[PDB]
């Protein structure tokens, strides 16, 4: 994995030694070169994971998250270069440094062979995210949002530290490859109950779990566009990655510990989606949609059937692409009206037709239109949870109604109807913005041709 | 109720609006033109019966029970004109009513496609921006203290002035673009 | 489809409908005949004139605009303003 970590670190001299007008073009070019290089991780086998060293390996779960992560950096650089154009050159280089450093932490978070190194990188991802939100966020509430984002994650994860060090003392190792073969069944006790909670609640917060999700409609909304892209597209999916790693060590206790949390998700996706029907802030509507979509990933990991893991990792990759594009579309209208009120700018298909078509495609992938990998993940999770209990389809199916309802209302409020009269600074769509939308949507639609690469280690 | 100039509906205006709505809902009930013609003259006779009532209390009472009469006897799906609010073609072409300022954001390769149109548009924008300060100082010298009482706007007073707040009435899009 | 109106055509059709009204003599009617003060018509008759204009040209005049059309010239001007004629 050292053929990826070293170019990501060489992106630091590539942004701090660049000419003052070349610091976006060079970082975009070489980050796209790293993203083209990321395809070598697709050397996956049906039996063995691509095991590099004592420190790094990459199975078919971590590989699509890595390719999405290394792809997301050029898209964040294209997204965040317009509103940081009047910024000081040193703070501009510091912003690019925080994005590069966050990618650097993420690519060795997903390839951590050992779990306490996973913890160190997993909590290392807080600090560039916290600095990006609380420094380049636009409104007043970025400080409070950074506080909530920091202290939900740390309060969930400092018991995870004690739990992982307890596994290191008990089993002898926190290598995942060793613990595939030295896993002991976890019996029923209160000690093993709080063992389970300490191993799970950090990732429950990072997914987020319903009831614990209060950081997210502040952290995703008060962030800048690159912060919202990396928080929605990757940093939620650390929780699903970590749960899929750590429920190896939590059997058969998960079979009766998952019962409340599944309820919290199966009801939570009914609530948060319903919250999306009454959100006046468009960016908050996309945030609660992200909560509603990650509730299915929580359910699928907690029922721990193969169809559920295949659908959950397909839903993670698909929601990363779709939610990143929806935040970028909301930014494309925020850079024209300078407000996030959804009812303010209306009728935008009369003025911006191709950008309305990008809104249309992002809304159709949001509502899981087949054969998108959104629908492949959604459908496979629904199959596995019908196998879990035959009544859950009601909570699934009603969700698939409400998920349609706000996905098109967002399309009807913003793009359709009569245009707002007094708003006259609606510029034509830049080539940069349509490039951003196309680089989100075209990989998402190409993955419908060959979806087996985003279906996880048990395809 | 809700009018831009008047703060209310007078009794005479309420009687006229009830008369128009009664004839329209009756015509919805009375599809054919001769049958509607007969019953519309009968309804005109009913309106011309109590025409000369001088007691405003008694007249308001008669208007109120006539509204009760109408609400009991209205068509459930009345006739609506196509471009009328509730019709089948109402606000249909609002997706083609592009505002004028979008023409300011064209590329020069498509502005040069219409040279006379934009060369004629520049003097519209010129006339607008040199009429603007005169009509603003017209509005702030004629409006009473405490704000304008009604939503009515004054006309132009001089020979050379344009009427105040005129641009989004003159340069509104056509109803069939 | 949808033949474009003119001011002369709207004027001819408005005065055509008003000549077909038995309470108006077609030898006195001009474009500037006030209905209440020159033709001596009732307010109910003015409402019926506006409704015949609606049935003639195929669109609804609202009440706040119906009550302020007191001559055929203002009716022709209102239909000109709502149909954008002489474009």
């Amino acid at each position: 994995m050292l053929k990826y970590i070293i170019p990501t670190m060489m992106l630091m001299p590539l942004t701090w030694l660049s000419k003052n007008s070349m610091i976006w073009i060079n970082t975009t070019l070489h980050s796209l070169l790293i993203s083209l290089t990321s395809l070598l991780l697709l050397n996956q086998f049906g039996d063995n994971s691509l095991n590099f060293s004592l420190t790094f390996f990459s199975d078919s779960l971590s590989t699509p998250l890595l390719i999405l992560t290394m792809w997301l950096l050029p898209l964040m650089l294209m997204a965040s270069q317009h509103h940081l154009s009047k910024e000081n050159l040193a703070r501009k280089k510091l912003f690019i440094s925080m994005l590069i450093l966050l990618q650097l932490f993420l690519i060795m978070t997903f390839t951590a062979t050992e779990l306490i190194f996973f913890y160190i990188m997993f909590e290392a991802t807080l600090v560039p995210t916290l600095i990006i939100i609380t420094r380049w966020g636009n409104q007043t509430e970025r400080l409070n949002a950074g506080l909530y984002f920091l202290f939900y994650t740390l309060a969930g994860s400092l018991p995870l530290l004690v739990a992982l060090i307890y596994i290191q003392n008990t089993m002898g190792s926190l290598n995942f490859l060793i613990l595939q073969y030295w896993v002991q069944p976890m019996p029923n006790s209160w000690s093993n109950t709080f063992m389970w909670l300490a191993c799970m609640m950090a990732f429950m917060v990072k997914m987020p779990l319903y009831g614990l999700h209060l950081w997210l409609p502040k952290a995703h909304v008060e962030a800048p566009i690159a912060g919202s892209m990396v928080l929605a597209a990757i940093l939620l999916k650390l929780g699903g990655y970590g749960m899929m790693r750590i429920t190896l060590l939590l059997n058969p206790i998960t079979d009766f510990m998952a019962y409340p949390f599944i309820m919290l998700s199966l009801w939570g996706m009914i609530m948060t989606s319903s919250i999306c029907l009454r959100q006046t802030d468009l960016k908050s509507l996309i945030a609660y949609s992200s909560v509603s979509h990650m509730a299915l990933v929580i359910v699928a990991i907690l029922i721990q059937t193969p169809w559920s893991y295949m659908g959950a990792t397909a839903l993670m990759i698909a929601h990363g692409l779709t939610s990143s594009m929806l935040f970028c579309l909301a930014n494309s209208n925020y850079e024209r009206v300078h407000s996030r009120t959804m009812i303010l700018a209306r009728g935008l298909q009369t003025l911006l037709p191709l950008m309305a078509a990008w809104w249309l495609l992002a809304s159709l992938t949001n509502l899981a239109l087949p054969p998108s990998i959104n629908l492949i993940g959604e459908l496979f999770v629904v199959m596995s949870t019908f196998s879990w209990s035959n009544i859950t389809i009601i909570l699934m199916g009603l969700n698939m109604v409400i998920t349609a309802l706000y996905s098109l209302y967002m399309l009807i409020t913003t793009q359709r109807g009569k245009h707002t009269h007094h708003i006259n600074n609606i510029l034509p769509s830049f080539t940069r913005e349509n490039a951003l939308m196309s680089l989100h949507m075209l990989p998402l639609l190409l993955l419908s041709l060959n979806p087996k690469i985003i279906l996880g280690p048990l395809y | 109720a809700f009018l831009p100039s008047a703060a209310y509906l007078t009794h005479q205006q309420k009687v006229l609006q009830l008369y128009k709505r009664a004839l329209r809902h009756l015509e919805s009930r009375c599809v054919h033109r001769d049958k509607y013609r007969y019953f519309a003259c009968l309804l005109r006779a009913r309106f011309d019966e109590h025409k000369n009532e001088k007691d405003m209390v008694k007249a308001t009472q008669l208007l109120r029970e006539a509204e009760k009469e109408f609400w009991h006897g209205q068509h459930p799906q009345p006739y609506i004109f196509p471009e009328s609010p509730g019709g089948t073609s109402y606000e249909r072409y609002e997706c083609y009513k592009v505002p004028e300022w979008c023409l300011d954001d064209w590329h020069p390769s498509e502005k040069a496609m219409y040279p006379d149109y934009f060369a004629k548009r520049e003097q519209w924008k010129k006339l607008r921006r040199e009429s603007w300060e005169r009509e603003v100082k017209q509005l702030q010298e004629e409006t009473p203290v405490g704000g304008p009482r009604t939503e009515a706007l004054p006309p132009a007073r001089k020979q050379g002035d344009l009427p105040p707040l005129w641009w989004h009435i003159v340069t509104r899009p056509r109803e069939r673009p | 489809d949808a033949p474009p109106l003119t001011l002369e055509g709207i004027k001819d059709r408005v005065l055509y409908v008003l000549k077909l009204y038995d309470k108006i003599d077609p030898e006195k009617l001009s474009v500037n005949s006030h209905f209440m003060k020159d033709l001596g018509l009732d307010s109910l008759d003015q409402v019926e004139i506006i409704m015949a204009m609606e049935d003639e040209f195929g669109f609804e005049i609202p009440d706040i605009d119906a009550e302020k059309l007191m001559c055929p010239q203002e009716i022709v001007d209102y239909i000109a303003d709502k149909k954008d004629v002489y474009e």
């Binding site: 009369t350 003025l351 911006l352 037709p353 034509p428 769509s429 830049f430 080539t431 | 592009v98 505002p99 004028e100 979008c102 023409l103 954001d105 064209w106 590329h107 390769s109 498509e110 219409y114 149109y117 899009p173 056509r174 673009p177 | 474009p4 474009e87």
Partner: peptide, 13 residues
């Protein structure tokens, strides 16, 4: 013959 200018946004970009 009495062709009217159709106002539309900038489709160049």
């Amino acid at each position: 013959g009495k062709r009217l200018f159709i106002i539309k946004p900038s489709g160049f970009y």
